[model samples]
Target chain A: PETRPFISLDLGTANVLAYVSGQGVVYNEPSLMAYNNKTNSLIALGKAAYDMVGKTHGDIRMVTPLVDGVIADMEAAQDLLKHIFSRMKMMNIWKNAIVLLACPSGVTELEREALKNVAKEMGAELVIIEEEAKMAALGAGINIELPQGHLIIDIGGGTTDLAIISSGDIVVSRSIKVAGNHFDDDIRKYIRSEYNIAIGQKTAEDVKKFIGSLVKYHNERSMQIYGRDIVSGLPKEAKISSEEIRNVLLNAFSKITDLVIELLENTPPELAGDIMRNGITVCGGGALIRNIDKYFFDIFQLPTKIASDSLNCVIEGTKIFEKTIKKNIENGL
Target chain B: PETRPFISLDLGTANVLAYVSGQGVVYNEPSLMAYNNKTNSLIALGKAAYDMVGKTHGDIRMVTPLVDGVIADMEAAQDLLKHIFSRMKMMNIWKNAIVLLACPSGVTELEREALKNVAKEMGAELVIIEEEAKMAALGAGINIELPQGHLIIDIGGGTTDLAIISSGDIVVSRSIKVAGNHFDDDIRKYIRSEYNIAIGQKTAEDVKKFIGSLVKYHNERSMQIYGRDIVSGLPKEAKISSEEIRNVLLNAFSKITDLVIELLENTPPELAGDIMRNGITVCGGGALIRNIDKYFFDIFQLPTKIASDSLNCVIEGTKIFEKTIKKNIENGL
Candidate 1:
C-alpha cells in the first residue's frame, strides 16, 4: 500500500470489510452469496443475500465461500469479489491498485496463492498479504515497532489465532478452528442434549448472540429459544440462562486457554516477561462476548484489554501500513 | 469390510500402503508421481517416480499430490490412484470392494469427499474412513475399545496428530503441520545457519536419519554432509555430530510437546488419570528417531514408550477394523 490507490480487504466468514485509500471504507457487507439454482445466476450479495437465507425456496440458495479462513469455495469467492469490484466502479478505480489482504496465520501456501489470484483476476497491479493478528495489534494502537513482546488473540467467524508480536513481526503464533461459529454450534448441541430440542443454525446463532457470556452474573441474562422437541416431534420452546451459556462457553474456551498456557511456557523468559507486562490484547467478532477479557485475566492473572473497535481492528491496521508505504514513496526508496 | 473382497489403504504423504483382504500388505511404495511436461502424460509412480526426482530431464517432473495430509493436486492424485489400482489388477478385484482409508484426524469434509470419489471411480462398492491415531493404537496392541484413555502421537511425513482415545472414539485430537518433513527442513536450516552451507533436500534428510537423536549419549553418532559453501562459493563438507542434530530436533519437537500438554489439560479428570496410568504411546516415522521415547519420558515423567514396528503401525492398525467390520457383517445387524 503506497500513495497509489490501494484497497485493504478483510474477507471474513461472517462479513467482509474493505478500506480504499481515497474513500475510507467503501465496502462493509455480509459475506453471503445468493444464487438461482435452475438458471445458475447470482441473485444477490452482502446483506441482501444474507437476508434471504433460511426463508428462501429451493430455486434460491445462500452460500459462504470461506470456512475456517480457507477458500472452501474458490469459484464463489471469485464471483462475489468480481461483483464487489464492479459495483465499486470497474477498471478505472482498480487500474493499478495495490490489494492488501488481511488473513489468518494458519492460512496455507495454496490458500495464499488463491487469494492473490483473486486480486490479480480483479486487475490489481500488486498484492500484499499480512496476518490478521499483526494487523489487529497495529489497529489496536500498540507500539509494535519496539522490542517488547505483545500477545494478541483475534477471534473471527470461523477461526481464532494467538500470536506473539515483537519488533513489528510475529514471533510465534497458533491458529485454532474455533470461534463465533463454534459458539453457535455448541449452543445448538448443548440445547439439544439438555432439553432434547433441535434448532436451526439461524436460531442457534441468535441464541448465542442473545445469551452468550464468559462470566456468570448476579442478575443473569436469559432468553427463550424455539426448536423441535426430539421426543415429541413438535415445535417447542426452552429458557436458557446466562450461567448455562457461560458454562458452555467456558468449556469451549478451555482449549484456547490451554494453548495460551502452552505458548507461554515455550517462549523465552525475556519475551514472556514482556508479555507479562504488556498483557494480552483481544479483538475481532469473538471479542463481542461479554467479559471475554475478564476470562483471560482470570486464567493468566494478566492485565488484559479489549480493543474498542474490535471488529474493525484488522481493516484499520492497513492504514498504518499505508502511511509507512507513502513515506517510503516520498523518500524515493 | 464384509466377506466380500476389500482393500485397506493408508494414503500417507511419504508413502502409500495398501492391504487387500486375501493378500496382506500387497502394496508399499513412495507417494510420488512423475509426468512428461510436453505431453502432460503420466510417466511413472512410486519408487520409480521418486528415483527420477532429482536426476530427471527437463521434460519430466515429479510431484507429491498430498501436502500436510491434503490433496494438493486432485488430477495427479486421481491419475496416480487409477494407475495403482490397474497395476494391482483392475476392476476385477475392486468391482465390489470395500475401500477402507486410514486418514489423519484433521481431514476436512472436502478432502474426505475427494478421497471417497477417487475410490468410487475405482469401483469401490463401499468406503469406510478411520482416524490414524485410533488405528495406530490398535496396531500398538492397546485395548482401545475399553473405557481406558490412551494417548497417541503419530508423526508421519507431512503432519503429526495428538489424540486421546476412549471408548472406541477420539476424546479430543489435533493435527499439526510438522513431522518428518519438518525435521528434514530444520536440519537443512540449521546446517546453513551454523556452517554457512547450502545442502540439498536429499542430503539433509540423509544427515537427519544418520545423526538425529532426542537424547544425549556418552558416545554420540556423527556424519559428514556435503553442501556448497556460502562464503567460498565452492563445494564443502561438514561434520555434524549427534548433539547438534539433537539440539535441532529437540527444538522442533517442542511445538508438538506444547500441543500434547495442551490436549492433556483439556481432558476430563477421569480421562487424564487414565492417560497418566496408561502412559503415552508414540508411532509412525518420527518414532524412529533415536531415544525418542526417553525424550518424552524426561519431559512428562510418565511411562512413555515407542511402539514396536512403529513405521507399520498405521497400516497394521487397519486390519483390526477389518475384523470388526467382518464381525458386524456376520451378525447381520
Candidate 2:
C-alpha cells in the first residue's frame, strides 16, 4: 500500500490523539479549545486550551468540541484538527492524507456523516471511520485476523465501548456512557457531599489519577485536595482517603461491570468460550486507574489485563488496521 | 382534576421559555449561560448570559447548554432552570412542581434519561417529556385529539422537527439539524465569501432576523453590517441586501424542505390526505421569519401558515397537553 503521510486519529471526548505515518503519535492533547470572545478567535488549542479550563474569565471560553466521543461543534473540531496537522508539519500532505478516525461503536449514521464532513473540511483525501474497540483490540497486539475470538474493552472519557472480534470482524459490541469522566463526577460529588468541598473537574481528575481505585487498597492513601467550601464560599482543603474515593469509583465501575456481563451474556457460546480462555483486554485512559484490571477480573470472574500502552491502543490499532487492510487488498482477499 | 402549580418549559437550543400555570409565559430568555471559571460558578444565565456572548473577557465563558435542541450540559441546564424558577418566585413549589419539558421529536432515549435526571436534581415532583411538535401543534391552537392528521413543522435553534400528528399521537416524524442556527451560519458564510468580512454570531443573527428571507424581496431591503475584514484585520462596513441574504437562507431552507417532503412521502396515505386538507402549521422561532410560510407553500404546494405567537407555541402546547392529561385521568380513560 502506498502511504502519503496518513493520519491515525483517536478523537476521544477527553483527549485527542493523532498519529502520523512517519512520526508515530505526533499530537496528544486534551480535546479542548479556548476562544477569545473579544477577538472572536481561538486563543488556544490542545494543552494550552486545557490549561485555561476553570481558569478563564468572561472573554476566554474553554470548550470541549466533542461530547460523548462525538463532534459537538464541527467548526471547533476542525480548528483543533487543523492546528494538530499544522503543528506536526503535516499541512502539506493534509489535502491528500488518508485520515483514519476511530469512532465509538455506537456512532450513528448522522454522526459518521458529521465526522466525514470534519475530515473533508480538514483537507483529507480519504477518510475511514473504524470502531474504537476494534482498534483497541488491534492496538493491544491482539491478532484479530485469526479466527479465534477476542474481547476488547475501551473505557474512554465519555463512553465504555466493548467489542468481541473474530476473523478481523466484530461479532458483537456494546457501548455505554459510563467511564472516566463519570468516575471523575463521582469523585467530585463524593468530595462535595462527604468533605463539604466543591472541586473542579481538574482536581477531581487529579484525585482520580493519584488514588482512584475500584478495589480496596492494602495501604490507606490520603491526599489533601483544595476546593471551595459550599457553606462559606471560601477556599478550603480536605484530606480525602483512597477508601472513600474507591467507594465512589466502585459505584461507577459496577455499572461498567454490569454492562460487560450483559454484553458477555449476549455473546455467542463459541465466542464466550474464546473470551473465557483469552481474557479481556482493557484500554483507554480509564485503564490507567489503579487496580482497574483486578476490578473487572474479580467481578466478571474472567481474566482481565491492561493493554500495553493502554492509552494509545486505539491510535496504534488504527495503524495496524490500515496495514491489514492494505495487505488484504494486495492479497485480493 | 386537581389543580397544582405546574410549569411548562420549552428548553430550546436558542431560547429557554418557561410558562407558569398562572403566569402564562413569564420567562423568555436565550438559552445561554456565562460561567465565571475563576469563581467556579455561573456568572449569568438566560438573557444576561446571552448579553455576555462575544463580549466576555478571559475569566468568563459563554455557553449554550442545549445543543441541537437537547441538553448537552446537565449542570448548566439545571442552573438555568433553577434561576428561572427562583426569578419567577416559584422557589417554594420547585420541589413539588410538575415540570413538563418540551423535547425535540428526535430526542434519543439517552437524551431523555439525562433530561429526567436534570428534572429530578431540580426537585421536580413529576417530570413529563413531550414531543416539541405535538406541543407546537397544541400551542398553535390545533386540536390534536380530533382524529385528524396535522402536519407541524417546528424549526427551533438547533433542529427542525417535522411530525404528522393525529389523535394526540405522532404518526410519523423526522428531525434534522438544520434550522435557525444553520440559517445564521449560511448568512455568515455568504457574507464571508461574498464580502470577505468576518462577522460575529450576533451580527449574523441580526442579519438573519431582520433582512433574512427565503424568497427575494420586491422592495430590496438593505442593512448595514459591521464586521472584521479578513485581509486587513480591521472593522469594515458592508451594505447587504435582503435579496442576497434570501439567497443564502434559501440553501438552508431547501434542506428543511427536502426533509419535510421526505417525511410527508413516508406518511400513511390516510394521514397524507388529512394533511393535504389541513395544510401545515409552522412554529418556533423559525416560524417568526417573514415570508417563511410562503417559502414552504412555494415548495410543497400546500397551504402553510405560521402559528400564533409562533415562538411560544411549544410552551402553550405543553400547557394544553397537561390539562388534557389531567382531564383524561379524571375520566379514568
Candidate 3:
C-alpha cells in the first residue's frame, strides 16, 4: 500500500486498521499473539498469530492493546508494542504525518495517550487520540436516541466492547477481553486433538474467516491444514471442515453470548423494549465474522445487525471525525 | 329432543344446553329472546332470537338468561323467564328432575337462589345451582394453579365471562353483557345499509357461522340471504360475502379483545408468563364461531385455544358434576 501524509490507527484492542489519508484502510488484522515457549519468544503475530494458536502453540496469550503501562510487563502487549514500532520505522511512513489514534474508553491517562508521544518521537507532527466507541458509532452511521437507550457490541480482537447508551450518555458499559483471539486459541487446541496435527495460529484464523458460521449450513466448507504431527513431531496435513470451526467459535463465544442475555434481562422494560426494537449494532474486527449478528439474534432472540463496514469502521470513523474537525475549522466554529 | 329424568342446564348468560341423564346434550341453542315492540310480545326465541335481531324490527333487545328478578323490569330478561316456564310445562321435562343450574358467580343472593326456588315451584324435586366459571373450568377440563394465574374467556350468548383464576381460586373476574346477540344486531344493521335488505337476526348469525374468519381468505365465502327488502318491504334474496361477516365479527369482538389484553398488562409478571406459556382457553358459543381462538391470538398475540366441545362443554361439566356427586354418594364419602 502507498503511504499517505496522514495515518489513522484503530489501535486499542482492535485489528490494526492502518487507514491512510485520501485512501481507504490498507491494513486490517487482529492484535493477537502466540509464542514458542521452547524459544522463549513469539512464533507469529497479528492475523498469523490469530490462526496458528492451537496447531503451533504450547503457550499463547492475547495482546489486548498497546503501547505501555505496568501492563507493559505482559509479553503479549510487549510483543505488539515492539512489533508496531519496528514495522512503522521500516515503512518510513511517519515523517510529518498527521495521526489519529484510538483506544478503549475505560483506559488510564497513560494507557490512552501512550501511542501519541511515541508516534511524535517517530516523526509525526500532530496526533489526536479519541476513545473507540465514539468513532465506532460515528462510522457505523448510528444515531444515539439518548432517552430511549440502545446497544452496541464493537466486537474487537482482544476485548468485546459493550455499552447500553441512552439520551447521548452511556447508561451502562462493560468491555471484556473476549473476542476473535479466544476463538483462534480454541481452534489451535481443537485442531491438535481433532486431526492430531499441530498448525499455526494463522491457519486457525484462516479456517474461521473462510467458513465460520453461527447457524448451520447444508454443505460444509473445508480448508487444508499443514502442521507438525503431535506424536511424531513430523510435518502433517489434513483437510478441516467448517462445522469444526463453527463449533470451536461457538464454544469460544459461549460466555459472551450468555453475558449479553443477562444484560437484556436486567435492563429496564422501557429501554429494553426500545433496544429490542432498535436491535444491536456490531462493529470492529469480530463483527466481520459471518453470521455474527445472526449468532446474537439466535442467542438473545432479539434483532442484531453488523455495521455497514464492520472491520475498518473504527478507522473510518476516525477519518469522519478528522473531516468534521477540518470542516469546523474551515467554516465558522 | 327426547327427555331423560335428569336435566342439566348450562343456563346463565349462556346458550342453553339441555343434557339429559343417558343422552348427550339433547338441545343446544342460545337462550336469547327478541321481542316485537308493537305487541310488547316475543317475536323470536333461542337461536331464532339470536338470528333475527337486526333484520326484523326497530326496537329489539337481548334475553341474557332466565328466571324472575327486579331485573324482570328488563323486558329482555322478562321475555326469557315467561318463555322457559311455559315451554317446560308443555314438554313435561321437569317432574322430579335433578336440575344442575349454572349462573354467573357475581350475582347477588336473590339472583343465585332465585333459580333454585323457581325450579321447585314448577316441580323440580332437586336443583343444584353452581356458578358458571366453576362449571366452565370443570367442563373445559382446566386445572387451576394456586399461585400462577391463567385466564379464561367463557364467552357465552349474553355475556363475555372473564376470570383470572389462580391456585383454584379466582383472582379477578368480570362478566360483561356482550356476546352472540351483539354481533347479530350489528349484522342486521350492516345488512340494512350495505344491501338495503332488512334481514332477520337468524340470517345474520348464519352468515357469521358460514364464513366468519379473523384472518383473510383468498376466495371469500358467500352465503345466500333471504330477507325483506327495506325499500319495497318485499321478499329478497342476495348473496352476502365472508369478508363482510368477518369484518362485522372482528368489530364485535374488538372490545372483548382489548379488555383481555389490558388484563394481561395489569397481571403479575410470573402469572402473565405462566398464562402466556399456558395460553388462553375459550369456550361457550363464541368458541364455536370460526377462528374465534385465532381472533384472540391475532388481537392479543398470545396462544389461544378453543375447548374440545365449544358449545356443549358447559353442559358436559354439569354432567361431570352429577357423576362426581353420584360417585361421592356411592363411595361412602
Off by over 4 Å in 2: A1-3, A328-333, B1-333
- Maximum-lDDT candidate: 1
As for candidate 1, its clashing pairs are none
The stretch of ten residues in a row with the least summed lDDT in candidate 2 chain A is A51-60
Q: Quote the lDDT for B101 in model 3.
A: 78
DockQ of each: 0.01, 0.01, 0.00
Per-residue lDDT tens digits for candidate 1, residues A227-319, read: 556664433567888888899999889888888887787777889998889999999888888889888988889989998899888888988
The residue ranges of model 1 lying beyond 4 angstroms of the native Cα positions read A1-333, B1-3, B85-91, B217-219, B329-333
Instruction: Tell me the TM-score of each prediction against the true structure.
Output: 0.50, 0.49, 0.42
Per-model interface RMSD values are: 17.9, 26.0, 26.7
Q: What is the C-alpha lDDT of each candidate?
A: 0.80, 0.80, 0.67
Per-residue lDDT of candidate 2, residues A253-305 (tens digit): 87888888888889999898999899888898988888888887887788898
Candidate 2 structure quality by residue, lDDT tens digits, B1-333: 455567788888888888877777888889888888898688888777776677788999787888865687767887777677675543455676777887787778888888878887877777778888788898899987665667899888898899888756676789999988888888889999999999988889998888887766555589999999999999999999988888888878878878886776566433543555688999888887778888877776667888988988888788788776567647764
Regions of candidate 3 where Cα sits further than 4 Å from its true position = A1-333, B1-7, B12-14, B20-26, B29-98, B124-126, B145-148, B217-219, B323-333
